[PDB]
Symmetry: C2
Subunit: 336 residues, 2 copies
Amino acid sequence: HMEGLAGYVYKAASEGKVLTLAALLLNRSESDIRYLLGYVSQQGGQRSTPLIIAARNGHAKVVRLLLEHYRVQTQQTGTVRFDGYVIDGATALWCAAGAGHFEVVKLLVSHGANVNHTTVTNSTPLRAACFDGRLDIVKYLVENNANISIANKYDNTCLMIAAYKGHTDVVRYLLEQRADPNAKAHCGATALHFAAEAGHIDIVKELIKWRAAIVVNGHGMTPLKVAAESCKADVVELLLSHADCDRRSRIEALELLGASFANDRENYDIIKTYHYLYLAMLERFQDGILEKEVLPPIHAYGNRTECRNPQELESIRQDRDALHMEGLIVRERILG
Amino acid sequence: HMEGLAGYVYKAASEGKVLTLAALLLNRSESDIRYLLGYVSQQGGQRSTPLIIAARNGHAKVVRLLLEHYRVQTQQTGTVRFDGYVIDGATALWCAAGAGHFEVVKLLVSHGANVNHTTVTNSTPLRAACFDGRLDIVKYLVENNANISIANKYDNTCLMIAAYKGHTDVVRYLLEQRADPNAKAHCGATALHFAAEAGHIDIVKELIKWRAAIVVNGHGMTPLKVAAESCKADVVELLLSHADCDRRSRIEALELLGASFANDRENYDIIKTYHYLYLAMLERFQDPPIHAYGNRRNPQELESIRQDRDALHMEGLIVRERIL
Ligand SMILES: CC(C)(C)n1ncc(Cl)c(Cl)c1=O
């Protein structure tokens, strides 16, 4: 019969009804108080504890009570639903971090919760807050000895995800806490790779100030080819305004940028196509003698052949259709 | 000294102040009037003739005088700027068509303009009106013997450009002729292919019934189900209804949109990735690649997808890599 009361207790905890929760908990034996609070409930996909669901919903009142008066264990783990995806191996500290409930986080940390508890995929509660972007929590966790080096299943640092999610504030903070910006992932990607693809120019600048290495992913893409391919012209100029395998890599990143202005249907500007593509050809002709390794015609892309001469390119500056197909040919060479 | 007056005449023509032009043009000999109206002027990038510059800016008023009073030749050619690229081989008939100046269009063709005259890229005024999408002009050109079969270089028919530019209205009307057209010849694409790429579900229905023929579903380098890559689920299901080619016998019609729903960062839904991709395992089990830098996952037999993790992202990429 006590299986039902555990649900009533869960309800009140998930609803933040501290009086409703407190009313249920008294006039119960120590044997019972443990059971009701250690019970795991299956609300759809989510499988949680009264403590966990309260910290998930930011009900600091229920959280304070469960920790102080009824000394509930912070180590309790559950499977919580964030967005549509289900995260397993989560603790009340982790949910509170992912949902941005600063006071509940402090409550859990203050009452002795493990800041470095790892989820099933080794997502630390610090990572949840870097995904979410709450600098106050991010600061508080690291100040309470949460480890920044604890990465994903796939070695996705807290720096990486924050750079991906565009949190310039936490990214800088993580970099002012000496976070290794040259750390890479299974994908082979650095935080500069994620920022360049996502075009977060402020973070790309921040990762530069902190002397990030120009490394290559598991496709042969530097952060400049990633940003050139992602049609993020802003981050292309900045990344080019420093280091690069100059000449060869620089023309290939300008040719990729120009190609993407014809492919990517969101930012499709064929005027920006000719600008970058012609700039590339001109840089190819400094000692002229820079190799145009063109490929034979295909049945797709018409039967055209990629221009090798700056006069060939000048002759399709006023052809919208030829310039489009040329951007497809360009992409084909650099990427295949 | 007479080159200077040619500029004043151009100016008044370009601004459409027809009354101002007569003051310059009157009291002049045949020798001069020929030069004054045939001068080519370089106003920025565009280098054109007064008759054209009037028709480009839609000044029907100056056009009436220049075409009616002195039957000047519509064949005069120039290079006009249409907001972006500069087009060469344009005639007043073409510019007025491209600029959507219906009044100038009617006047130009009525006075004997070459209605199927092609630009440098063999763009007919009919192409211009379907590109920009003015059905009023599109129709009017067709009754006046403009040829719908003309198309440009690379064989992009007027149907194709309208099919791409989503001008459903012109498409329905335009089916007074060819459906499944020039196969883009160069691109290898049908007018319905451009429709599927752009996901204009409205015309793709037309390409089959209510005007257009059946249109060949054949292209090779991706069937007309290009929309699976273009993340156009709307037309993807639509094409799937036509069966025995894309459904009943066609077991291979595993379009697997979900791979594209993880790649395109504009329409990226990894929930939609697993949804369509799981149909593949379910359809594959009614009755494979390599691990590049630690990959597949792609198998449908393996658990029929464990789900939940972001790993599906890289898994959606493996699918795209396999299908190419
Ligand atoms: C766009 C694409 C697929 C080239 N790409 N973008 C970003 C990153 Cl971080 C990597 Cl590793 C990558 O390969």
